[PDB]
Ligand binder design. Structure first.
Ligand SMILES: *[C@@H]1O[C@H](CO)[C@@H](O[C@@H]2O[C@H](CO)[C@@H](O)[C@H](O)[C@H]2NC(C)=O)[C@H](O)[C@H]1NC(C)=O
Ligand SMILES: *[C@@H]1O[C@H](CO)[C@@H](O[C@@H]2O[C@H](CO)[C@@H](O)[C@H](O)[C@H]2NC(C)=O)[C@H](O)[C@H]1NC(C)=O
Ligand SMILES: *[C@@H]1O[C@H](CO)[C@@H](O)[C@H](O)[C@H]1NC(C)=O
Ligand SMILES: *[C@@H]1O[C@H](CO)[C@@H](O)[C@H](O)[C@H]1NC(C)=O
Ligand SMILES: *[C@@H]1O[C@H](CO)[C@@H](O)[C@H](O)[C@H]1NC(C)=O
Ligand SMILES: *[C@@H]1O[C@H](CO)[C@@H](O)[C@H](O)[C@H]1NC(C)=O
Ligand SMILES: *[C@@H]1O[C@H](CO)[C@@H](O)[C@H](O)[C@H]1NC(C)=O
Ligand SMILES: *[C@@H]1O[C@H](CO)[C@@H](O)[C@H](O)[C@H]1NC(C)=O
Ligand SMILES: *[C@@H]1O[C@H](CO)[C@@H](O)[C@H](O)[C@H]1NC(C)=O
Ligand SMILES: *[C@@H]1O[C@H](CO)[C@@H](O)[C@H](O)[C@H]1NC(C)=O
Ligand SMILES: *[C@@H]1O[C@H](CO)[C@@H](O)[C@H](O)[C@H]1NC(C)=O
Ligand SMILES: *[C@@H]1O[C@H](CO)[C@@H](O)[C@H](O)[C@H]1NC(C)=O
Ligand SMILES: *[C@@H]1O[C@H](CO)[C@@H](O)[C@H](O)[C@H]1NC(C)=O
Ligand SMILES: *[C@@H]1O[C@H](CO)[C@@H](O)[C@H](O)[C@H]1NC(C)=O
Lengths: 201, 370, 414, 99, 49
C-alpha cells in the first residue's frame, strides 16, 4: 500500500531562532506529496534518512532497531519505550528472527498521531518528533506542522537498515531545498518545496 | 575586529581607501542633487491668510499649518505610501524633510501669488485669474475664454485635484518609481551583508573560527581567500552603487529642469509637462523624490467645419491674422484655432496679400469693413 | 587630517579621518552546566585492583573529564604523560578514553613505559613504542599488603612470546618449557604460568604493591564524547564585552532581551545572517547582542589658511560614549551652538551646518533657507517693473577629460 | 609570487578602467549639455526658464577654458517696480474690452 | 555541466544570481526604451486612400 505525504515531514533544520522570516534551506526533507509506504515487522532500508509516522489508540508501536546487520555482528541502535521508560542502547545486540514484545555497549540512556524523523549525519543520530491529537483512521491527516528535535546521539554507529518494534508509515528524505516561513514566535508555520512544481520554483 | 586580518589587508594597498572615497563622492553627489532640484528659489515666499485665488482651491496642496511638518494633504499621502553593525552606516541627508517641505511651499506660494516672475526676478504679485489669463494666452487661446468660463475652469481644476487625492489614496503603486529605488538600495545592502556568510574557498566563513583553529602559517592563507572574496564583494557593491547613482543623477537633472521650466515658467515643449497644453505645475515633496502636479488644457468637444485658406473679396486675397476661416454651411467666420469662437470677417481680422489667382482653394466671401 | 590627505595644508571642508570604536573592557566565557563528570573515581578509588596479567580496562565515554582532579592531586608518586599535557587535555575531546588498572611491585613501575622490557612488559602489560597517554602509579601498601602476606595478586612468569601493545593474556595453560607436550599436566618442563606476589607491609619499597592506571586516548570516525571541563565565568550586561557562548564568539553589549526562544533554540539570527540574540547556557535567559557603538570621526575645519581650530563630529553616537552639541547626525564637539541661522558653509547634516565666524570660533547652526518674504497678494493689485538691469552671469561646464592611455603589459610586467 | 602580483595589478587596472568609464559618462552628459546650451543659447535665444541664467535670456557668449566652456549669459532682470490697481476688462458700452 | 564545479561555485554565494539579475534588468530596460520612444500614440491612425 501507499499514501500521500501531503505537506508533512518538515522539521527545524537547526537550533536558530528566526521571526517573521522566509528562510531558504537545503537539507534532507520529505518531498511534498510524495509516496509514503503504509503498513498495518518488515525490515526496511535507511538510504539517507527516514521519516516515520504512527497513528495510535492503544500504544502498539514501541520502538526501533537501526543498524547494518542487526544480528549481533555489528553495533545497532535499540530504542524502546517500555511502558513508562525510554531506553536507548547501542550494544551489539542479538535480535530474534521476529523481535516482537508480548501483546559490547558504547552508550546507554534511560529517561493520536506521532511523527518522527530519524537521520544519521557524521555519526550523529538526529531524532526529531512531534505529537498531536487526531480524528482519522485510514490515512495521514492533511495540514502542516513542524518537528522539534528531541535527541542528538553521539553514537557513531553507521546505519544502513532498520525495523520497527510493535498502522504506521515510512517515507524517505531527499536532499531538497525548502522555503520555510517563521512567524513572530520563531515557529515554522508554512513551507514550500522548491522542486515540486514551477510555481513553487 | 581582527588584527591579523587587518595586517593581511594592509598589503592590498589603497583598495579600501578608494572604495570609501567613491562612496563619499556618491553621498556628496546626492546632497547636491536634492539642493539643485529644490533650492531654486532664493527667498521663502509664504501665502497670505486670504485664499482668494479666483475660485481655485489650493487647500489640498498648500501646507497644513496644524500638521506633522507643515506638509500638504497630498504630501502626507505621498509620504505614507513609501517604505547595521557590520561596518555599514547610512548618513542623514543634508536637507531634512521639513526643509524640503519649506522649499516646495516657497515654490508653490511664489507660483500662486506671482506667476513666473518670482523665477525671473523679484516676485511681482498678480491676481490668480489674470495669471491664468496669461497662461491661456501662452497656448494660443485668447484670454476672454478664461474670463467667460472662469467658474467652469475653477470647478474642473478642483475636481481634478480631488481625483488626484483619490488616486494616490487608493493605488500605492502610483509611487512605484520611488519605491523601486528604495528596494534596489536595500537589496544591494542585504546582498553585501549576506556575502559575509560565504566561504569563497576558505575552510570557514567565520574569521574567528579560522584564527582560533588553524596555526597562523595556514590560517593566513585561509584569511587571504576570505579577504579576496570580501574585497571583491565590496568592489561589486561600489560599482553597482556608482552606476545606480549615475541613474539617479540623470533623473535629478531631469527633475531640476522640470521644476525650472514647468513650475517656474510655462513650458512649450510638447509632452514635457503632461499630455495637453501646459498651463502650470505644482511641486510636492516625496521620500527621495519629487512629484509634479501638471495642470494642462485639453480640448474636449470638437466640430466639423468647412474651411478655406483665404477669401476673395474684390480680387484681393485675405488671410487670417491669427485664426482660421470656417463655415457652418452658409456663412464664413474666422475663429481662433484652439477654440471655436466664430467672428465675422472684417479687415481687422484678415490681412490682404496678392490676388485670387495664386492661392489654391481660395473661396468667395465678403469682408466687412468697419 | 593632514596625514589622511597627504598634505601639509588642508582646504576648508569636512573630512573623515578615522573611526571611533569602543574597546571591550573585559572577556566573558559561558559554557553549559558542568555535569555528567567522567567516572574516574570508580577506577582510581576501586577497593580491589586487578592482577597485572588480568589488568582491568575501563571505557570512559560521553562525559566531562576533569583531569585537574588527577594532576593537582598529591596522592600519586608517578604521573608521566607521553606526547600530551594533561592541562591541554582540558581543551580536547576524544571518542574514547581508556583507564587500564592493575597492581605490580615498586621495582616494576619503570616497566610501564614505551620501549621497556622485563617480566611485566614482556608477559603482562605492554605499552606501544609510540605511546600517547599517561601512566599514573601510587604505593598501595596500606591496601594491598597483609601481615601474613597477600598472595591474591598474580603475575605471568612464562609465555611463548612477548605481548603486543595492549594485549591481555589470562590463560592458565601449562607452559611447555621442553619438547614433551604437557597435556595440561604439570611436571618436569611443565609449569603453571602464573605466580603470586608476596605483599607484606614490612617489605622493602621496591617489593611493596603499587596501583597503576594507564590513560589512553582514542579518536575514531565517531563523535568525540569525552571533553574537558571548560569552566565559565560571570556575565556582565550593558557594557561592551568580548563574549564566547557555547560555540560562538564575538564582541557586543549584552542586554536583557524581548524574544521568546523555543525550548530547543540557542542562537537568534537577523535577516542578514547576523547573530542577534543568544541563550545563556546556564541561566535560561535570552540576551540581545547590540554591537558596540562605532562610527566615523569627521573633522570640520576652516582652511588652515584662516585657522588651525577644528571641530570633531562623531557620527551616530551618543554624547556620553565619547561645548558639546547633540545633532541628528551625531555628537559634535568643539563647535559652538548658536541660535541664529546663516547660509550653509560646511554642511554637517540634518539641516546643521558649521562655519568659522567672529574672537573667532567655529559655530554650528541650523542653516537658513533664505530670507522669508510675502507677496502682497490681493485680487485687484499687480506689481509692474518700471526699470531694469542687464546682468551677465557665468556658467562653467566641463566638456572633456585628459585622454589617458595605459599599457597593460608594461604596467603589469615591466 | 608573480601570479599574486599579476592578479593584484590586473585588478587595480580593472578598477581604474571602470572608474574612468563611469567618469567619462559623467563628462559626456555634461558635454551634451554644453553642446545643447551652445545650440540654443548662443546660436539662438532660448525661452526655457533658468536654462540660460536667471532672468529673461537676451544672449550668450562662449569662452574656451581648459577642458571646458564658459558661457557669459546676458539676461534681462526687472529692477524697480510699483503697485498698481488692475482689472481684467472694462465696460465701455456694456461690452467688455480686454487688452 | 559539471557537478563538482557547481558545488565549488556555490561557495561564492550570490556572485552569480546578481549577475543574472543585472542582465535581466538591462533587458527589461531595453523593452522600456523602445516603448517610450515609439508608443507615444494611443490609437493607430491611417491615411486615406
Ligand atoms: C477646498 O476643498 C476642500 C476639500 O478638498 C474643502 O474642505 C472641505 O470642507 C468641507 C466643509 O467644511 C468639509 O466637510 C470637508 O471634510 C473638507 N475636506 C477636506 C479634504 O478638508 C475646502 O472647504 C475648500 N476650500 C474652500 C475655501 O471652501
Ligand atoms: C451659420 O451661422 C450664422 C451666424 O450664427 C447663422 O446665421 C444667423 O442665424 C441666426 C438664427 O439662429 C439669426 O438670428 C442671425 O441673424 C443669423 N446671422 C446672420 C448674419 O444671418 C446661420 O444660420 C448658420 N447656419 C447654419 C446652417 O446653422
Ligand atoms: C504514488 O505512486 C503511485 C504508483 O506507485 C501513484 O499512483 C500515485 O499517484 C503516487 N502518489 C502521488 C501523490 O502522486
Ligand atoms: C506567540 O505566543 C504568545 C504567547 O507566548 C501568543 O500570545 C501569541 O499570539 C503568539 N503569536 C502568534 C503569531 O501566534
Ligand atoms: C466629422 O466628419 C467626418 C466625415 O468627414 C466623420 O467621420 C466624423 O465622425 C465627424 N466628426 C464628428 C466629431 O462628428
Ligand atoms: C479638394 O478636393 C476636391 C476633390 O478632388 C477637388 O475637386 C478640389 O479642387 C480640392 N480643393 C482643394 C482646395 O484642395
Ligand atoms: C468666385 O467669384 C469669382 C467672381 O467674383 C468667380 O470668377 C470665381 O469662379 C468664384 N470662385 C469660386 C471658387 O466660387
Ligand atoms: C546550573 O548549576 C547552577 C549551580 O552551579 C544552578 O544554580 C543552576 O540552576 C543550574 N542550571 C540549570 C539549568 O539547571
Ligand atoms: C577518591 O577518594 C578520595 C578519598 O580520600 C577523594 O579525595 C578523591 O577525590 C577521590 N577521587 C576520585 C577520582 O573519585
Ligand atoms: C594663505 O596662506 C599663504 C601662505 O602660506 C598666503 O600666501 C596666502 O595669501 C593666504 N591666503 C589666504 C586667503 O589666507
Ligand atoms: C543618547 O541620547 C539620546 C537622545 O539624543 C537618548 O534618548 C539616549 O537615552 C542616550 N543614550 C543613553 C544610553 O541614555
Ligand atoms: C537659544 O535660544 C533658546 C530658546 O529658544 C535658549 O534656551 C538657548 O539658551 C539659546 N542659546 C544660545 C546659545 O543663546
Ligand atoms: C534705471 O536704473 C539705472 C541704474 O541701473 C539708473 O541709472 C536709471 O536712472 C534708472 N531709471 C529709472 C527711470 O529709474
Ligand atoms: C505693495 O504694497 C504692499 C503692501 O502690502 C507692500 O508690502 C509692497 O512693498 C508694495 N510694493 C511696492 C513695489 O512698493
Amino acid at each position: 500500500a501507499y499514501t500521500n505525504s501531503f505537506t508533512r515531514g518538515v522539521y527545524y533544520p537547526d537550533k536558530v531562532f528566526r521571526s517573521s522570516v522566509l528562510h531558504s534551506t537545503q537539507d534532507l526533507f520529505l518531498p511534498f506529496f510524495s509516496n509514503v509506504t503504509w503498513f498495518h515487522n518488515p525490515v526496511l532500508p535507511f538510504n539517507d534518512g527516514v521519516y516515520f509516522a504512527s497513528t495510535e489508540k492503544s500504544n502498539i508501536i514501541r520502538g526501533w532497531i537501526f543498524g547494518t546487520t542487526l544480528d549481533s555482528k555489528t553495533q545497532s541502535l535499540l530504542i524502546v519505550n517500555n511502558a513508562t521508560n525510554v531506553v536507548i542502547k547501542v550494544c551489539e545486540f542479538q535480535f530474534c528472527n521476529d523481535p516482537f514484545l508480548g501483546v559490547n555497549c558504547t552508550f546507554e540512556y534511560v529517561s493520536n498521531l506521532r511523527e518522527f524523523v530519524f537521520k544519521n549525519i557524521d555519526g550523529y543520530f538526529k531524532i526529531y518528533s512531534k505529537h498531536t491529537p487526531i480524528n482519522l483512521v485510514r490515512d495521514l491527516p492533511q495540514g502542516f506542522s513542524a518537528l522539534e528535535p528531541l535527541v542528538d546521539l553521539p553514537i557513531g554507529i553507521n546505519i544502513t537498515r532498520f525495523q520497527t518494534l510493535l498502522a504506521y508509515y515510512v517515507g524517505y528524505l531527499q536532499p531538497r531545498t525548502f522555503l520555510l516561513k517563521y512567524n513572530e514566535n520563531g515557529t515554522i508555520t508554512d513551507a514550500v518545496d522548491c522542486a515540486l512544481d514551477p510555481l513553487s520554483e | 575586529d581582527s588584527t591579523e586580518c587587518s595586517n593581511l589587508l594592509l598589503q592590498y594597498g589603497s583598495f579600501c581607501t578608494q572604495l570609501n572615497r567613491a562612496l563619499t563622492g556618491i553621498a556628496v553627489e546626492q546632497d547636491k542633487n536634492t539642493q539643485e532640484v529644490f533650492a531654486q528659489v532664493k527667498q521663502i515666499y509664504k501665502t497670505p491668510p486670504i485664499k482668494d485665488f479666483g475660485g481655485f482651491n489650493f487647500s489640498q496642496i498648500l501646507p497644513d499649518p496644524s500638521k506633522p511638518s507643515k506638509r500638504s494633504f497630498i504630501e502626507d499621502l505621498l509620504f505614507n505610501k513609501v517604505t547595521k553593525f557590520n561596518g555599514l552606516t547610512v548618513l542623514p541627508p543634508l536637507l531634512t524633510d521639513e526643509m524640503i517641505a519649506q522649499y516646495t511651499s516657497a515654490l508653490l506660494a511664489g507660483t500662486i501669488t506671482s506667476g513666473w516672475t518670482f523665477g525671473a526676478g523679484a516676485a511681482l504679485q498678480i491676481p490668480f485669474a489674470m495669471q491664468m489669463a496669461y497662461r491661456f494666452n501662452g497656448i494660443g487661446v485668447t484670454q476672454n475664454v478664461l474670463y467667460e468660463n472662469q467658474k467652469l475652469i475653477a470647478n474642473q481644476f478642483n475636481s481634478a485635484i480631488g481625483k488626484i487625492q483619490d488616486s494616490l489614496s487608493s493605488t500605492a503603486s502610483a509611487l512605484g518609481k520611488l519605491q523601486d529605488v528604495v528596494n534596489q538600495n536595500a537589496q544591494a545592502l542585504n546582498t553585501l551583508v549576506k556575502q559575509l556568510s560565504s566561504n569563497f574557498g576558505a575552510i570557514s566563513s567565520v574569521l574567528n573560527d579560522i584564527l582560533s583553529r588553524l596555526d597562523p602559517p595556514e590560517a593566513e592563507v585561509q584569511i587571504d581567500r576570505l579577504i579576496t572574496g570580501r574585497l571583491q564583494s565590496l568592489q561589486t557593491y561600489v560599482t553597482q552603487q556608482l552606476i545606480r547613482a549615475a541613474e539617479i543623477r540623470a533623473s535629478a537633472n531631469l527633475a531640476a529642469t522640470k521644476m525650472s521650466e514647468c513650475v517656474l515658467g510655462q513650458s512649450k515643449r510638447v509632452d514635457f509637462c503632461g499630455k495637453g497644453y501646459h498651463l502650470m505645475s505644482f511641486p510636492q515633496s516625496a521620500p527621495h523624490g519629487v512629484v509634479f502636479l501638471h495642470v494642462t488644457y485639453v480640448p474636449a468637444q470638437e466640430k466639423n467645419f468647412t474651411t478655406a485658406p483665404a477669401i476673395c473679396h474684390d480680387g484681393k486675397a485675405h488671410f487670417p491674422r491669427e485664426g482660421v476661416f470656417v463655415s457652418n454651411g452658409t456663412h464664413w467666420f474666422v475663429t481662433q484655432r484652439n477654440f471655436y469662437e466664430p467672428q465675422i470677417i472684417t479687415t481687422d481680422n484678415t490681412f490682404v496679400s496678392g490676388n485670387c489667382d495664386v492661392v489654391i482653394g481660395i473661396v468667395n466671401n465678403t469682408v466687412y469693413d468697419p | 587630517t593632514k596625514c589622511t590627505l597627504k598634505s601639509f595644508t588642508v582646504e576648508k571642508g569636512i573630512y573623515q579621518t578615522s573611526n571611533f570604536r569602543v574597546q571591550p573592557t573585559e572577556s566573558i566565557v559561558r559554557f553549559p552546566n558542568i555535569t555528567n563528570l567522567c567516572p574516574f573515581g570508580e577506577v582510581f578509588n576501586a577497593t580491589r585492583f586487578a592482577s597485572v596479567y588480568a589488568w582491568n580496562r575501563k571505557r570512559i565515554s560521553n562525559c566531562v573529564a576533569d583531569y585537574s582532579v588527577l594532576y593537582n592531586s598529591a596522592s600519586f608518586s608517578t604521573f608521566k604523560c607521553y606526547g600530551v599535557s594533561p592541562t591541554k587535555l582540558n581543551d580536547l575531546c576524544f571518542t574514547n578514553v581508556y583507564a587500564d588498572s592493575f597492581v605490580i611491585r615498586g621495582d616494576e613501575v619503570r616497566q610501564i613505559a614505551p620501549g621497556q622490557t622485563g617480566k611485566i612488559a614482556d608477559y603482562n602489560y605492554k605499552l606501544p613504542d609510540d605511546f600517547t597517554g599517561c601512566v599514573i602509579a601510587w604505593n598501595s601498601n596500606n591496601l594491598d599488603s597483609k601481615v601474613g602476606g597477600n598472595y591474591n595478586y598474580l603475575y605471568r612468569l612464562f609465555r611463548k612470546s612477548n605481548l603486543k601493545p595492549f594485549e591481555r593474556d589470562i590463560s592458565t595453560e601449562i607452559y611447555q618449557a621442553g619438547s614433551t607436550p604437557c597435556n595440561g599436566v604439570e611436571g618436569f618442563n611443565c609449569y603453571f604460568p602464573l605466580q603470586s606476589y608476596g605483599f607484606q607491609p614490612t617489605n622493602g619499597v621496591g617489593y611493596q604493591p603499587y596501583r597503576v592506571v594507564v590513560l589512553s586516548f582514542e579518536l575514531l570516525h565517531a563523535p568525540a564524547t569525552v571533553c574537558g571541563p571548560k569552566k565559565s565565568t560571570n556575565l556582565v550586561k550593558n557594557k561592551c564585552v568580548n563574549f564566547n557562548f557555547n560555540g560562538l564568539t564575538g564582541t557586543g553589549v549584552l542586554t536583557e532581551s524581548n524574544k521568546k526562544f523555543l525550548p530547543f533554540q540557542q542562537f537568534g539570527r537577523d535577516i542578514a545572517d547576523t547573530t542577534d540574540a543568544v541563550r545563556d547556557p546556564q541561566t535560561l535567559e535570552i540576551l540581545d547582542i547590540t554591537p558596540c557603538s562605532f562610527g566615523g570621526v569627521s573633522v570640520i575645519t576652516p582652511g588652515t589658511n584662516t585657522s588651525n581650530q577644528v571641530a570633531v563630529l562623531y557620527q551616530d553616537v551618543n554624547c556620553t560614549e565619547v561645548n558639546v552639541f547633540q545633532t541628528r547626525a551625531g555628537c559634535l564637539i568643539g563647535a559652538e551652538h548658536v541660535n541664529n541661522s546663516y547660509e550653509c558653509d560646511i554642511p554637517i547634516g540634518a539641516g546643521i551646518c558649521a562655519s568659522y565666524q567672529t574672537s573667532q570660533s567655529i559655530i554650528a547652526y541650523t542653516m537658513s533657507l533664505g530670507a522669508e518674504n510675502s507677496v502682497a497678494y490681493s485680487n485687484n493689485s499687480i506689481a509692474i517693473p518700471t526699470n531694469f538691469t542687464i546682468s551677465v552671469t557665468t556658467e562653467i561646464l566641463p566638456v572633456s577629460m585628459t585622454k589617458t592611455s595605459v599599457d597593460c603589459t608594461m604596467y603589469i610586467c615591466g
